[PDB]
Amino acid sequence: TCSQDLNSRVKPGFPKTIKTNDPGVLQAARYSVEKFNNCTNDMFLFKESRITRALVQIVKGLKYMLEVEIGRTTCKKNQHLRLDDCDFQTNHTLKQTLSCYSEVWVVPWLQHFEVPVLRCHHHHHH
Amino acid sequence: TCSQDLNSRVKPGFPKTIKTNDPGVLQAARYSVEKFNNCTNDMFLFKESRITRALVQIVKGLKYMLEVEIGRTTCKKNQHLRLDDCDFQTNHTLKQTLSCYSEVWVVPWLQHFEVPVLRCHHHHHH
Numbered sequence: 001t002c003s004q005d006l007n008s009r010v011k012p013g014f015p016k017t018i019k020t021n022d023p024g025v026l027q028a029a030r031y032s033v034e035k036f037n038n039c040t041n042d043m044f045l046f047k048e049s050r051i052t053r054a055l056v057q058i059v060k061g062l063k064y065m066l067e068v069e070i071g072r073t074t075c076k077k078n079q080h081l082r083l084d085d086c087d088f089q090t091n092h093t094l095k096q097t098l099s100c101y102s103e104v105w106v107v108p109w110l111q112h113f114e115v116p117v118l119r120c121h122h123h124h125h126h
Numbered sequence: 127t128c129s130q131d132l133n134s135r136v137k138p139g140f141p142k143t144i145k146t147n148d149p150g151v152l153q154a155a156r157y158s159v160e161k162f163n164n165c166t167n168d169m170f171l172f173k174e175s176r177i178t179r180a181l182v183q184i185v186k187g188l189k190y191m192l193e194v195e196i197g198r199t200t201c202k203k204n205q206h207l208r209l210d211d212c213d214f215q216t217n218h219t220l221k222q223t224l225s226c227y228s229e230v231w232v233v234p235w236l237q238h239f240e241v242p243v244l245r246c247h248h249h250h251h252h
């Protein structure tokens with residue numbers, strides 16, 4: 001499986017630290033939680049709640065490597081609700097947070113984004 | 127394409143800096159150049175020459191993210207030659223170096239390694 005770029009015209013980028021409030025980082029964390037909502041069957045939408053760590057790598061575009069917390073909101077899935085206007089669950093029985101790692105590839109000049117990696121963990125209540 | 131680990135039993139690891147002379151890093155850089163030799167058709171084998179940057183991430187094993195330089199050796203390909211005993215080209219017309227980025231996944235308890243990403247650049251002689 002030699003599907004590699006082994007004679008690249010550009011020197012490949014290495015991941016570098018980036019501020020966790022960088023507008024690009026913030027948008028990448030939104031993509032991540034949207035990938036999560038798309039890929040699960042909760043009755044509520046989740047929303048990014050905290051970005052603890054972030055790296056960005058140049059690869060024909062921007063690849064974000066993110067450590068992001070996501071939380072259940074009070075907005076139901078499948079009602080065409082926008083996450084910017086969703087607040088987190090207050091009800092303790094409905095409060096749920098996950099710790100995720102994601103990689104998000106964004107090519108703004110081609111209007112393209114992808115979330116090729118998303119790993120999430122809900123910690124046991126014991 | 128929801129082929130993700132979204133209900134993981136473990137909190138996912140984030141990539142952390144690791145020393146570029148760490149024995150695991152050194153072995154990962156060897157895997158990278160071996161992936162390079164496997165995936166190209168030079169008449170000589172290449173060998174890792176310098177590891178400039180390294181991150182390691184815990185993901186059911188160790189994933190290395192490496193910035194590694196590779197160089198052409200005087201050992202011919204397809205002669206069953208071991209890289210530890212190969213020295214770099216002296217002949218200026220045969221000297222060739224590439225800057226690579228690689229990701230190498232190693233699971234030592236399962237005797238498994240993989241090089242899922244390798245990107246390499248030969249800088250123009252102008």
Ligand SMILES: *[C@@H]1O[C@H](CO[C@H]2O[C@@H](C)[C@@H](O)[C@@H](O)[C@@H]2O)[C@@H](O[C@@H]2O[C@H](CO)[C@@H](O)[C@H](O)[C@H]2NC(C)=O)[C@H](O)[C@H]1NC(C)=O
Pocket residue numbers: 035037038039040041127128
């Ligand atoms: C967004 O999700 C759909 C997958 O449909 C999914 O429903 C989720 C809630 C979850 O349970 C998931 O496991 C389930 O498959 C994706 O479309 C699906 O993709 C797979 C593989 O490509 C196809 O085999 C399915 O037929 C297809 N189903 C439908 C209804 O479209 C979609 O790819 C995904 N998008 C992204 C970008 O993640």
Ligand SMILES: *[C@@H]1O[C@H](CO[C@H]2O[C@@H](C)[C@@H](O)[C@@H](O)[C@@H]2O)[C@@H](O[C@@H]2O[C@H](CO)[C@@H](O)[C@H](O)[C@H]2NC(C)=O)[C@H](O)[C@H]1NC(C)=O
Pocket residue numbers: 001002161163164165166167
């Ligand atoms: C190691 O390389 C071989 C690929 O054979 C290659 O020869 C190289 C020098 C290079 O020119 C490359 O582009 C060429 O394909 C891999 O086996 C091949 O894999 C592909 C896809 O899996 C198959 O379609 C080929 O039929 C198959 N060919 C042979 C002769 O086996 C092999 O996967 C690769 N190994 C690794 C781990 O990178």
Ligand SMILES: *[C@@H]1O[C@H](CO)[C@@H](O)[C@H](O)[C@H]1NC(C)=O
Pocket residue numbers: 091092093094
């Ligand atoms: C919280 O949610 C549960 C289940 O939907 C419900 O039984 C309970 O009444 C709710 N409590 C409050 C105060 O909203």
Ligand SMILES: *[C@@H]1O[C@H](CO)[C@@H](O)[C@H](O)[C@H]1NC(C)=O
Pocket residue numbers: 217218219220
């Ligand atoms: C270097 O290699 C080239 C091509 O193989 C050859 O023409 C030349 O004689 C070599 N020079 C020396 C000093 O080895």
Ligand SMILES: [Zn+2]
Pocket residue numbers: 079080081
């Ligand atoms: Zn809609």
Ligand SMILES: [Zn+2]
Pocket residue numbers: 085086087
């Ligand atoms: Zn609000």
Ligand SMILES: [Zn+2]
Pocket residue numbers: 095096097122123125
């Ligand atoms: Zn919980």
Ligand SMILES: [Zn+2]
Pocket residue numbers: 111112113
């Ligand atoms: Zn697109």
Ligand SMILES: [Zn+2]
Pocket residue numbers: 121122123124136137
């Ligand atoms: Zn936990």
Ligand SMILES: [Zn+2]
Pocket residue numbers: 205206207
């Ligand atoms: Zn052999």
Ligand SMILES: [Zn+2]
Pocket residue numbers: 211212213
């Ligand atoms: Zn020697």
Ligand SMILES: [Zn+2]
Pocket residue numbers: 221222223248249251
């Ligand atoms: Zn050169």
Ligand SMILES: [Zn+2]
Pocket residue numbers: 237238239
């Ligand atoms: Zn294996």
Ligand SMILES: [Zn+2]
Pocket residue numbers: 010011247248249250
């Ligand atoms: Zn260059």
